[PDB]
Amino acid sequence: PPPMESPFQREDRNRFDRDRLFSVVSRGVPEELTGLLEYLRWNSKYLTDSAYTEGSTGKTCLMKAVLNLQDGVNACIMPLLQIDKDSGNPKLLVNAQCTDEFYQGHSALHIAIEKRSLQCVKLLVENGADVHLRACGRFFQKHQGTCFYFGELPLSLAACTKQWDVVTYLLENPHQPASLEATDSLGNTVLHALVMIADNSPENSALVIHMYDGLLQMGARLCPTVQLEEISNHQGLTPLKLAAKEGKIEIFRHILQREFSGPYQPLSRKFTEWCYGPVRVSLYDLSSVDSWEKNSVLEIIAFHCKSPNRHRMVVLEPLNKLLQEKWDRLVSRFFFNFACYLVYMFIFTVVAYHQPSLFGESMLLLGHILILLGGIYLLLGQLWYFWRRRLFIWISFMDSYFEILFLLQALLTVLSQVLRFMETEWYLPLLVLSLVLGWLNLLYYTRGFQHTGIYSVMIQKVILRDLLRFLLVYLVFLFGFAVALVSLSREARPYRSILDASLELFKFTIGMGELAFQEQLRFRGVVLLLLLAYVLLTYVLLLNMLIALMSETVNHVADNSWSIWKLQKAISVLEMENGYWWCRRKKHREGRLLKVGTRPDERWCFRVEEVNWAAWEKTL
Amino acid sequence: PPPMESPFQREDRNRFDRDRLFSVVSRGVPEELTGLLEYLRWNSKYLTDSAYTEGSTGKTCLMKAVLNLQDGVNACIMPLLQIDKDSGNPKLLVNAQCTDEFYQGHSALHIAIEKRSLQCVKLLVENGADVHLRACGRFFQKHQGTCFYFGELPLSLAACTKQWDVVTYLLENPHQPASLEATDSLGNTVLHALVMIADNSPENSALVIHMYDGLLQMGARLCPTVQLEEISNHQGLTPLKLAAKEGKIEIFRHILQREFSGPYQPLSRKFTEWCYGPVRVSLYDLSSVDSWEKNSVLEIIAFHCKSPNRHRMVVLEPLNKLLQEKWDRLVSRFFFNFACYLVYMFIFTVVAYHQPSLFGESMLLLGHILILLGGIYLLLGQLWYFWRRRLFIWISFMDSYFEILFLLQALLTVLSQVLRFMETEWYLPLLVLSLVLGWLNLLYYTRGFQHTGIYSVMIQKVILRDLLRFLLVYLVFLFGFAVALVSLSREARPYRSILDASLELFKFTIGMGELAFQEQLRFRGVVLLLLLAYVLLTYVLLLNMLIALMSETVNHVADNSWSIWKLQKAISVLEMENGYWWCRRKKHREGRLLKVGTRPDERWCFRVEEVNWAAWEKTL
Ligand SMILES: CCCCCCCCCC(=O)OC[C@H](COP(=O)([O-])OCCN)OC(=O)CCCCCCCCC
């Protein structure tokens, strides 16, 4: 794509001509525009015609004038608009937009706002600039390349660039006021766009929070009957749900715990009830948060968010206490499920232990029937889970590999019981491997306790992703030395096959490597030197991997295992609330309906008791 | 060498004599010089004669006067010059220089500049001091001993000591102005000398950058038609190339990304094109940087620089994006080379696996021919590489040991195929060892991916240089206890040879050491005590080496593996751009020719798109 503006490269082409006009509006001298209007009238042409624009983009002379503002003012703008009006152009020059795929919908008002020229914005608005044109090119979309997403609207651009005067002028100018309800091509409003450009750094979060609160307070004046935070985009997300999905923890916490006093009190989501010393009791708005409603904040955080700080969101209030009462309500069902799986696995172990050769027989047949029925039940449950987690399936197993393991165990159980009916001998390794998987699957339920559940998070770490990368080097070492030892030992004056030599070389890592002078071999010295070289290289490699893993993991970073265990409990709770595949529970709504003021402002509120001695001592 | 000045040691000798004159010019009283001119006229002698100088160095009385400045002024200087003029000396005393090998070319103007006496500099220049005398002794060269390299010229001395007034006076005095184009004995100009004295500390870098920019701006006035940064020294290096070779990262980054506005705009190498929010688009000068030109900055960084921060240079713009587009253009050739090596190694493994005893036979002969041809091809390619990397060969394999390994593998392959024609049995261990090396050489191509290529940098570290130092102690332990166990076990009431006992003692480190009461030996108690002592000493040594290696490597230093992987990709790209030994590619020039102003200032410019949200938010 060509540059937006370039002092060194002339515009593409893919008497008053285009080059003279562009040079005049670049210099900014209005008196050199004389004769342009007469030339346009003589040739019956307009400034919006393709001959007077950049060929590749459709960038006009007015955008060239705004792109060359000197101290916020270009004197060629108003005479250019006067010439455009006097030429009888049915398409206004202020509303002309670029046509290329990279800068599609880009207009001069966007350039005037981005150049922070309030005078130019006023001059464009006074002459009929549409304040709802959407810059929807690839440069203005959100992706990993060179781009600037701010929404697509001029008001969203003015908000995302921290321009209070431009926002105030656009919202209530008498010519054409901008609407806070206006949406971009994705359905995003200005609050959605502020959530989009939000980062978790303190300065960006402060800017986004200030802009969000100010725009909400002005929406309380300009459109008081409009719920600005209840507007959903094309994904069905509100700004709170969008902040939950994108991992924008700071603005999510600010919206979730928002409190105002006096005026703008209906804009609050947190309402202080009473205080007594270090005890503070508050009411929290549960709208769009409680899992009783479809597509809630909790469901989005658990199953739709990809961000690494999902575990930091679930420990914020009121989410923490709400998930705590849900877990206290469902802990008996959790341990009943654990007891059922223990019974199933015990019968599995008894049946697999007493297999026959390739009253007791009837009991073994009954146990085989029970194993088949339990495998069918688990298979149907896992298939229902993966059907419900349809669209976000890649997000489903990135932290829930036990779902994959349970599905695989049930599939192996059903396959082994099918192969037993066909009387093939391969049912027994399948049954044994499903028994292995079933006993490994019992470690899912360690998350029911704090002591085991936190520890199961502390043990597993980034070792798994580096194990494969070390294994890539180690397998090359193993295969090369194995084929070498097989080739060299074929002549007599140990290593008969590739698998045997590979096993003997793998024995060195477990402390059982045989290292001897193979006197019956012809090349025994070279074989011994190859073994010693392999041992030294493998030990150097193992020391390298240990020290490298030691460098990334020991860094004194504070322990986040408690919040990850809380996130695991939240996922378990939200799955347990749906019931079973054969019996669906009716959802129970949390909180109480309370009137908190006048919009009667009746909301479902959750009461949270907080004790904080240091915070209370700081205000004395 | 004697001291430059010493209040305690008298000058060497290797009526108005030398001692009285030296004491007078040390005290600084001009009225005690009476009778010196008459004595010199009577004896027909001059102050520059060997009788009036230090014997070992040739240091004169004027240098003695300047070395004893009191508050920047010595009153004996002007009468001494008057006596020198009145004596009819054909050699001026101001231009007399020291003659010893340590202080060769040292003059009084250098001492006046180093003493920061602008009055003395003006006094010397007004009386005819040559401002282009070069201090070229061993003290003024650059080496690891006691030295001060500043260039060799008075202007370079004034610049390297941060003396703006002295530089300004030397550049435009009406008596004899110094030239910015003047070069030292190495061809270094003042900008080269500033690059030479540059350090990567912030204060030294700030001083060097300020001096460099000021001298370039004054060269824009004094010699506007002279390209000061295009001057090459005797090594053919410009100041940018010299900064790239010496690892001077700060001044290299400053020169590479230099930008000026308004006046001194032709001195810029970076030209901002357009900005829109956090997006900044700039043009970068590619002169002497692009690898299309011989001896470029990229080639110097990859193959000529010895400094440890080579990987920090390649991640700077515009080098990072340029190397990225080069890699995107050559990645298919990289993986085609990988596929060819995989095919060659697979045929190697198949041929080595199916060797006979010391249609299938014809296929094995064809495979032997293919192995021989591939070995010849790889040998010729590696020989061509080491021929092209002729002068800097020691810099070539300090980070590219795979070149050595590929050459050794090809040599072993050719030697094994030669020995097979001679029908000796030793071809088979050579073939097996070349197979080992060829399978190890496949790990070169892990750098083609980020995931494997970064990890291959993270695993290897300083363990290799400490492994040899630990091995020096461990081999002494092993040999001493081995000869002990062989000597002690010779008498009966296990260890028959040195190699056997060494292997049994090495078995303890791999977890297979045999530790038993050798009841058939006569000295079984002493043998058991020797084994226990060896085990304890070896385990203490291993624990020491593990903890010592743990101390140097775990230090929370930020990971530089990504930049080292980028440097490896840069080396691969620059080698792939030359083509093959049998087919040399034509170089493709990067960037576009654009006019950036008036010197028409036409440069080859590279467009770089940068997104930086925090930097843009800081200016709002
Ligand atoms: C169809 C109508 C008949 C229903 C019969 C009652 C079924 C109870 C189901 C139950 O408790 O589930 C236990 C377990 C499910 O694991 P999970 O979803 O918690 O975790 C899933 C992975 N996250 O599932 C199992 O362990 C398999 C059940 C088979 C053994 C039953 C033994 C009963 C002993 C009293």
Ligand SMILES: CCCCCCCCCC(=O)OC[C@H](COP(=O)([O-])OCCN)OC(=O)CCCCCCCCC
């Ligand atoms: C003389 C005219 C005939 C030329 C025939 C084509 C040769 C292709 C060369 C090639 O792709 O090089 C692969 C490799 C070189 O390694 P490198 O320089 O990337 O890395 C070097 C170390 N850094 O070299 C090899 O692997 C050896 C080539 C022998 C096997 C060819 C198999 C072909 C299968 C299609």
